[PDB]
Amino acid sequence: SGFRKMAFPSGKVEGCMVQVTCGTTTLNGLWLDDVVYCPRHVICTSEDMLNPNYEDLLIRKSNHNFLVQAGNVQLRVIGHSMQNCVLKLKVDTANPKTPKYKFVRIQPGQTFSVLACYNGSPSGVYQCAMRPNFTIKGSFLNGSCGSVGFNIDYDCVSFCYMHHMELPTGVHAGTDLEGNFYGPFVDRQTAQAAGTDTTITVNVLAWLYAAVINGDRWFLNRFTTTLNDFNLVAMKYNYEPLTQDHVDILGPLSAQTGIAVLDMCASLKELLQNGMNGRTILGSALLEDEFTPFDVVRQCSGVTFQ
Amino acid sequence: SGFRKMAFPSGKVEGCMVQVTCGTTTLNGLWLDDVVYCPRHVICTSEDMLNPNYEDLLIRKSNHNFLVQAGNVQLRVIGHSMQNCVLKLKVDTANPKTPKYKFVRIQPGQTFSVLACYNGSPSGVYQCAMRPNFTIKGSFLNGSCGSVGFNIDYDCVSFCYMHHMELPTGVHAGTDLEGNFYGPFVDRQTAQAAGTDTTITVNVLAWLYAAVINGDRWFLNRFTTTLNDFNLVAMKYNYEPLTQDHVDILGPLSAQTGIAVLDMCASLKELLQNGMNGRTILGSALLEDEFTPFDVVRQCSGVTFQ
Ligand SMILES: *[C@H](O)[C@H](C[C@@H]1CCNC1=O)NC(=O)[C@H](CC1CCCCC1)NC(=O)[C@@H](NC(=O)OCc1ccccc1)[C@@H](C)OC(C)(C)C
Ligand SMILES: *[C@H](O)[C@H](C[C@@H]1CCNC1=O)NC(=O)[C@H](CC1CCCCC1)NC(=O)[C@@H](NC(=O)OCc1ccccc1)[C@@H](C)OC(C)(C)C
């Protein structure tokens, strides 16, 4: 038993990480089949960042201005193109370690694993969620750009995030693997509003179920509530409105613990109106919202991969 | 910027994980060179668990009663021996994916990465610490036994933990890779006292430095204290006594942030005497003690591996 915030094993992704250099800028790229993916702002100088014309900037570059290094090995670039905010470098060598992969665009509230990378070498791995305002709260230093987020379905790697830039909040923004930003962000060094972040109500309920499943049950009360009543408390409190779909996705945890979702909503309501009283749930003094219901199900089912 | 609880990339360890079966018991093993390591209690039936004579039980077994499966592939066992509480299965095939590795026995307060495994296939990865009472608070279901903890030094894998059993606390116990338990635990299904757990004072201070480095500085005060004065507050509060060595290891974070360790101790003291007032530090409403000072240094330095 026990419950930890847990990332997918990153082996399948480590084999895809390469170093990409263009001029005096180095960052990470994703090497799959015979294509290298990376943020297009690798083509920018530190002055270009304030207002780049990427088309014009890309025109001044040729294949040989792009150094791709996979470990020690130099790949030869033979085609380059710009898809949205990513740059796709065609190389002469397919990656012998290409996993079975997909590119997905995830939804706010879903979770994924980040492998943070510098100079093409993996640094660490951690788990997180696409916030409702389409930011992620991660850990990214200079040179982490091009690090990717992913989920694993048995053998198949679903890539969903590529890191591009930190906002003035210490929150991070980026794109899917077709180069479209999550959220309204553009890749330019100009002030940008992240927007009001809300809490992922369904994820919090799934966590409370993970708590019950792991012995923590003090928050459990004699009350119930209605979907509309609870939603009315959800909104004084920043919470995502709870829908019937949310209720259904919480259904399996419902039946395992024998606790109705709306009874659980009542306990959450009391927590939101009465706080923690200096107590903890699964060793946190806060309400945690970065476990999807599926993260909960599989953590106490033992789903494996590879 | 930002600060997450971050695990080493597990690729080097995924390639070492195999399935070990003996009778009607299956668990994970660590395959390195031509040896497979696993908990010796794989040789036990569900009745044996209450009071096993491991010597006598091991005598009834022969090499062919041990099925080792590396992915799909059956290894042939040709020698078996018992070292403390681990069992070492000599196989006819060296693991072509053996990393450069070491076996270390870590100290209370140090951190490591766990790759949780079922039937020899990795499930997830998370970070944690050997508690002062020599327990770890992880996430382990039935069949997770044989999962290992590790740190990575550039290319070299330092194995330090092998999971054996959960206590009645939802805390976990296990051995180094020579088979000696951390703590006073034995591998038997008998009630065992974990013992009073204390907080890793030096780790908490290192975190407060990580906080300052990442913008969170409200806890910072106009006071200072003495090593003995603070230690006197450390003990009403469960904290490990702070030593001069602790002070020195915190020295580099000292100089980066320009804040004396004993000034930081005063802020921690006020936190311990006055609580959080419903506020947060790096997004936690609790004082976090599972980052060593070295975890902090490298997270905001960007150390890579492979
Ligand atoms: C790639 O390695 C990095 C990763 C950053 C660096 C440290 N932490 C990270 O997450 N990405 C960058 O450095 C990019 C580079 C430019 C981005 C697109 C345009 C051309 C290249 N920039 C940022 O990450 C900046 N974000 C940013 O400026 O956003 C808009 C803005 C501007 C001014 C005030 C507020 C907001 C970073 C460097 O800016 C901060 C200084 C605010 C972090
Ligand atoms: C190996 O896959 C598992 C991993 C466990 C299972 C679920 N979570 C885990 O961490 N390990 C075990 O199942 C071992 C098996 C025996 C251990 C040594 C003797 C022979 C094999 N046992 C345990 O993990 C038990 N721990 C335990 O009993 O500790 C002493 C004790 C006894 C009675 C009351 C309190 C404490 C588990 C199964 O016991 C609990 C039911 C308390 C979890």
Swiss-Prot record, chains A, B:
The active site is at 41 (for 3cl-pro activity), 145 (nucleophile). Signal peptide: none annotated. Changing residue 145 to A: Complete loss of 3C-like proteinase nsp5 cleavage. Changing residue 189 to A: Does not affect ability to cleave and inactivate human TRMT1. Residues 1-306 form the Peptidase C30 domain. Coiled coil: none annotated. It catalyses: TSAVLQ-|-SGFRK-NH2 and SGVTFQ-|-GKFKK the two peptides corresponding to the two self-cleavage sites of the SARS 3C-like proteinase are the two most reactive peptide substrates. The enzyme exhibits a strong preference for substrates containing Gln at P1 position and Leu at P2 position. Inhibited by pyridone-containing alpha-ketoamides compounds 13a and 13b. In turn, alpha-ketoamide 13b (tert-butyl (1-((S)-1-(((S)-4-(benzylamino)-3,4-dioxo-1-((S)-2-oxopyrrolidin-3-yl)butan-2-yl)amino)-3-cyclopropyl-1-oxopropan-2-yl)-2-oxo-1,2-dihydropyridin-3-yl)carbamate) inhibits SARS-CoV-2 replication in human lung cells. Inhibited ex vivo by michael acceptor inhibitor N3. Inhibited ex vivo by compound 11a and 11b. Residues 1-306 are cytoplasmic. It is found in: Host cytoplasm; Host Golgi apparatus; Host nucleus. There is a cross-link at residues 5, 90 (Glycyl lysine isopeptide (Lys-Gly) (interchain with G-Cter in ubiquitin)). Cleaves the C-terminus of replicase polyprotein at 11 sites. Recognizes substrates containing the core sequence [ILMVF]-Q-|-[SGACN]. Cleaves and inactivates human TRMT1, preventing tRNA guanine(26)-dimethylation of tRNAs. May cleave human NLRP1 in lung epithelial cells, thereby activating the NLRP1 inflammasome pathway. May cleave human GSDMD, triggering alternative GSDME-mediated epithelial cell death upon activation of the NLRP1 inflammasome, which may enhance the release interleukins 1B, 6, 16 and 18. Also able to bind an ADP-ribose-1''-phosphate (ADRP). 3CL-PRO exists as monomer and homodimer. Only the homodimer shows catalytic activity. Interacts with host FBXO22; this interaction promotes the proteasomal degradation of nsp5. This is 3C-like proteinase nsp5. It comes from Severe acute respiratory syndrome coronavirus 2. The gene is rep. The chain holds residues 3264 to 3569 of 7096 of the full protein.
